[PDB]
Design a protein around this ligand. Structure first.
Ligand code: NI
Lengths: 54, 70
């Protein structure tokens, strides 16, 4: 199915992928966190300006 | 409408920072801007659950494949 290609991997290749999986996720989540933080800043800055203006 | 997230907001979050500045967020009320903010956060969580769900299956796919060979 989704991961059919794993049937072509050597036994070690599978272990190697299991080795890297956590760190690979942590990088993914960090890039996500950075992405949305920078998307919010414009909005958060505006609200701060509203709060200071009123 | 129920829990509506405007399509433009989704597009915005997926785009790059280059045209950020030209957003006239001043035009909105404070409640609408708090609305937008909280929606982005939902968008984060969606994408997060997708990411974290993929790695569930992927990990499970790998371990299943190892056992198979054994
Ligand atoms: Ni409604």
């Amino acid at each position: 199915g989704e991961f059919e290609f794993l049937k072509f991997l050597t036994f070690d290749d599978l272990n190697q992928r299991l080795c890297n999986i956590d760190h690979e996720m942590e990088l993914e989540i960090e890039q996500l966190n950075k992405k949305y933080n920078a998307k919010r800043q414009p909005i958060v800055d505006a609200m701060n300006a509203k709060r200071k203006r009123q | 409408l129920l829990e509506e997230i405007p399509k433009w907001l989704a597009v915005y979050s997926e785009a790059d920072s280059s045209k950020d500045h030209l957003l006239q967020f001043n035009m909105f009320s404070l409640p609408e801007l708090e609305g937008f903010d909280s929606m982005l956060v939902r968008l984060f969580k969606q994408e997060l659950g997708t990411i974290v769900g993929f790695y569930e299956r992927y990990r499970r796919a790998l371990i299943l494949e190892k056992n198979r060979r054994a």
